[PDB]
Amino acid sequence: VHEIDETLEKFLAENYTPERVQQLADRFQRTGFVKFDSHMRIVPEELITAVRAEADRLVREHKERRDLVLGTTGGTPRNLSVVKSQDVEQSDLIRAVTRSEVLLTFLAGITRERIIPEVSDDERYLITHQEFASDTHGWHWDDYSFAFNWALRMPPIASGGMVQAVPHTHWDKNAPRINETLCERQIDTYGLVSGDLYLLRSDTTMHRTVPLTEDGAVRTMLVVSWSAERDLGKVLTGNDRWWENPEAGAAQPV
């Protein structure tokens, strides 16, 4: 019920000072990435366990396999299973924590700008489920500024699945220049463990997941998308919504 908004207001208050937020806002501006791991929690471990169970049920009852390349992102592959945004919104818990006014106001101190939780209907939420060798979420950008991700299940680092990122880029759907960007920039790699969360500046940080090296290395990620003020009134272009529509124009199966 309404207990989650009071639980977050107490957990954030006893775990963060205003200047620590400013330090995280500096790292966020510099790298586009702030990891909330066991050393710096953002949500209590009780809620993570509950969210993990909600995602396991949604994956078990709604996972749809994706094996395609996206033209608007230089033909990068998408090899994983998805749970559409429409099915994730069935979870009252996920909607409660992700649309919480306490969380959006706190995280606004890290982004240093207003976080509007409203995005496109088919991209509000997303669960990616990777489990096969060479499963990957290829290099891409997001249409919206922010992504709040729940690394609910992570394999060991040696199995792959780390998040790679190139901050201070931009999405040009007509000329993605994926590999050209890598030749001009350096790649940051972030290791995640089960229960980690992270905030991503997803519209200017080219990112991907390192392909899994072996079958059974289950990787389940809850992806929450939020708008910035720059995202209001956005007109979607490219016809590349592969997660909702597998037969999108810019999507070619493999």
Ligand X SMILES: O=C(O)CCC(=O)C(=O)O
- Which residue's CB is nearer to ligand X, number 4 or number 68? 68
CB of 158 to ligand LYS, least distance (A): 25
The residue type at 21: V
SS3 101: helix
Q: Is residue 142 part of the contact set for ligand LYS (CB under 6 A)? A: yes
SS3 202: coil
Segment 22 to 81, residues that bind ligand X, using CB under 6 A: none
CB of 50 to ligand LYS, least distance (A): 22
**E strands along 117-186, which residues?**
125-130, 136-140, 146-153, 163-166
25 binds, among ligand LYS, Fe ion, ligand X, none (CB under 5 to 8 A by kind): none
Q: How many CA atoms lie less than 13 Å away from 199 in the CB half-sphere? A: 30
The encoded tokens of residue 133 equal: 């060798």
Q: Is residue 123 part of the contact set for ligand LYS (CB under 6 A)? A: yes
Segment 134 to 173, residues that bind Fe ion, using CB under 5 A: 142
Q: Is residue 83 part of the contact set for ligand X (CB under 6 A)? A: no
Burial class (CB in 10 A: 0-12, 13-18, 19+), 224: buried
- Which residue's CB is nearer to ligand X, number 35 or number 100? 35
Q: Is residue 87 part of the contact set for ligand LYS (CB under 6 A)? A: no
Alpha helix segments (H runs only) across 89-140: 92-98, 101-111
Task: Give the x-and-dash track for 170-209 against Fe ion (CB under 5 A).
Answer: --------------------------------x-------
Nearest of 157, 221, 154 to residue 194 by alpha carbon? 154
Q: From the CB of residue 170, how many other CB atoms can be counted at a distance below 10 Å?
A: 11
Quote the CA–CA distance of 8 and 6 in Å, as a whole number.
5
The residue type at 246: P
Q: From the CB of residue 157, how many other CB atoms can be counted at a distance below 10 Å?
A: 13
Residues near ligand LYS (CB under 6 A), total: 9
Q: Rule CB under 6 A: choose which of 24, 88, 163, 251 binds ligand X.
A: 163
Residue with tokens 């997660």: 243
70 binds, among ligand X, Fe ion, ligand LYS, none (CB under 5 to 8 A by kind): ligand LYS
Segment 65 to 84, residues that bind ligand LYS, using CB under 6 A: 70, 73
CB of 247 to ligand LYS, least distance (A): 15
Q: Is residue 209 part of the contact set for ligand X (CB under 6 A)? A: yes
Residues that bind ligand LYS (CB under 6 A): 70, 73, 123, 126, 140, 142, 223, 225, 243
